[PDB]
Amino acid sequence: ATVLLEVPFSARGDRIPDAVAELRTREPIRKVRTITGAEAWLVSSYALCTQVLEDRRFSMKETAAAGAPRLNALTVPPEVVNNMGNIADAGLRKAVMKAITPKAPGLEQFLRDTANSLLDNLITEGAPADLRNDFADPLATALHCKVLGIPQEDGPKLFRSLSIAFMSSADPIPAAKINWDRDIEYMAGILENPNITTGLMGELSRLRKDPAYSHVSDELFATIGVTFFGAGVISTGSFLTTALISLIQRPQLRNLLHEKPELIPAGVEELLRINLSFADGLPRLATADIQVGDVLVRKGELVLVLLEGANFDPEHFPNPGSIELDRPNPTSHLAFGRGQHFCPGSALGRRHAQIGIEALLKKMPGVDLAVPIDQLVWRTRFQRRIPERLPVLW
Numbered sequence: 241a242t243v244l245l246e247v248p249f250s251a252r253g254d255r256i257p258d259a260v261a262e263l264r265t266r267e268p269i270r271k272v273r274t275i276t277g278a279e280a281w282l283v284s285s286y287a288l289c290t291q292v293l294e295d296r297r298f299s300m301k302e303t304a305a306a307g308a309p310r311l312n313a314l315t316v317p318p319e320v321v322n323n324m325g326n327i328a329d330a331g332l333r334k335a336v337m338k339a340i341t342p343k344a345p346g347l348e349q350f351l352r353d354t355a356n357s358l359l360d361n362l363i364t365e366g367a368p369a370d371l372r373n374d375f376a377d378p379l380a381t382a383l384h385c386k387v388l389g390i391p392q393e394d395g396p397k398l399f400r401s402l403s404i405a406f407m408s409s410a411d412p413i414p415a416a417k418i419n420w421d422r423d424i425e426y427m428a429g430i431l432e433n434p435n436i437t438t439g440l441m442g443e444l445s446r447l448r449k450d451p452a453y454s455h456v457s458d459e460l461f462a463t464i465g466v467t468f469f470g471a472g473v474i475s476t477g478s479f480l481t482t483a484l485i486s487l488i489q490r491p492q493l494r495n496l497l498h499e500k501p502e503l504i505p506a507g508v509e510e511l512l513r514i515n516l517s518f519a520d521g522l523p524r525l526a527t528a529d530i531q532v533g534d535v536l537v538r539k540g541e542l543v544l545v546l547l548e549g550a551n552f553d554p555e556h557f558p559n560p561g562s563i564e565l566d567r568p569n570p571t572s573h574l575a576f577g578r579g580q581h582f583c584p585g586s587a588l589g590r591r592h593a594q595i596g597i598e599a600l601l602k603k604m605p606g607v608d609l610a611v612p613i614d615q616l617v618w619r620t621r622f623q624r625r626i627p628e629r630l631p632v633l634w
């Protein structure tokens with residue numbers, strides 16, 4: 241006898257398990273057991289993943305309900321699971337989304353300067369260099385301090401919350417509440433700090449004192465800062481890191497993008513499509529009985545939308561494991577989700593990766609792994625898949 245199939249299948253971010261394609265072909269929605277012991281429906285085809293994400297009766301907010309089957313333990317207060325809904329109800333969605341576009345004058349040049357300085361320091365120190373800890377993550381942290389309007393010198397401490405905040409744990413995490421409360425206190429202080437006049441926090445600070453927002457809570461304002469810093473930094477740092485592995489693995493593509501940087505946006509779009517950064521399916525709780533493929537999902541059941549299921553589906557992306565810069569449907573992947581909860585930072589995440597890669601290829605055109613790929617250490621029980629270190633030479 242065997243036990244019910246357990247998710248996640250693998251913490252490795254450098255290869256997709258053969259099991260994904262087998263499930264997609266034979267059982268594109270099928271029952272699995274999560275790390276908490278709960279049962280869930282794992283959805284692994286493009287067509288069914290899109291159906292789930294585009295039907296709001298598969299609810300994000302209700303995943304936080306007491307007694308629900310859980311993918312993993314909450315690491316934030318349950319109301320924060322509905323963060324974007326709370327932002328919209330407060331009348332803040334347009335202002336938040338304007339503050340986090342990569343369009344602020346000087347932002348791209350800031351990103352370019354920061355990337356180049358980080359790379360110069362690695363060259364001075366000599367190979368091997370760690371492109372996660374000493375390039376991709378600092379670049380993500382610096383970008384998000386700039387976008388939020390907060391001091392660069394505060395970035396490192398805020399960053400150090402993230403290896404716990406973004407755990408994917410079977411049980412509640414005591415350190416997560418310690419760090420959450422401290423970071424909330426920090427952002428609350430930022431809102432009262434007269435030096436903070438730019439970026440997302442500068443704008444929130446002004447709206448907070450505007451009569452049209454006098455009954456929006458100070459807790460929500462601080463929460464926006466904590467959640468956008470954390471989600472943005474973890475997502476961009478982790479995506480860039482694993483994208484760099486996929487690029488290093490492909491010397492022909494590396495050289496092409498070095499020789500024609502105008503193709504970097506199309507290359508980043510394919511790197512997004514093939515990215516394994518999300519460690520778990522996206523969770524949703526059914527609020528009605530809904531037919532998904534051959535399965536009638538019942539009200540109250542947990543559904544997990546496997547992004548690499550959709551993004552490697554050959555019915556939608558032929559030759560799915562190959563980076564092709566000339567696909568006719570290049571942005572139709574689900575790397576940023578789909579529907580009501582589509583990533584509000586998508587443009588910023590694209591630009592972070594594009595500029596980081598452009599700078600790396602100019603400074604280190606011969607970049608290559610400094611260890612055999614099987615020597616990378618894949619973080620476990622985390623909401624992203626990332627190597628603990630990414631050692632390179634050039």
Ligand code: HEM
Binds near residue numbers: 582
């Ligand atoms: C390449 C980088 C990024 C990737 C791959 C990514 C991926 C995603 C995905 C897949 C979702 C949907 C989650 C779901 O539907 O359950 C999402 C949502 C979200 N992302 Fe991103 N993201 C990235 C960058 C960013 C940045 C830069 C920010 C903020 C500065 C950000 C903030 C958020 C937030 C707040 C949500 C929740 C949206 C909602 O619930 O409506 N992300 N992201």
Ligand SMILES: COc1ccc(-c2nn(-c3ccccc3)cc2Cn2ccnc2)cc1
Binds near residue numbers: 315321401419468
């Ligand atoms: C729906 O927009 C969201 C945005 C962010 C989060 C989230 N922020 N942080 C976090 C960030 C910084 C410090 C500490 C915690 C962790 C999560 C993800 N998480 C945990 C439990 N359930 C979801 C959530 C929603």
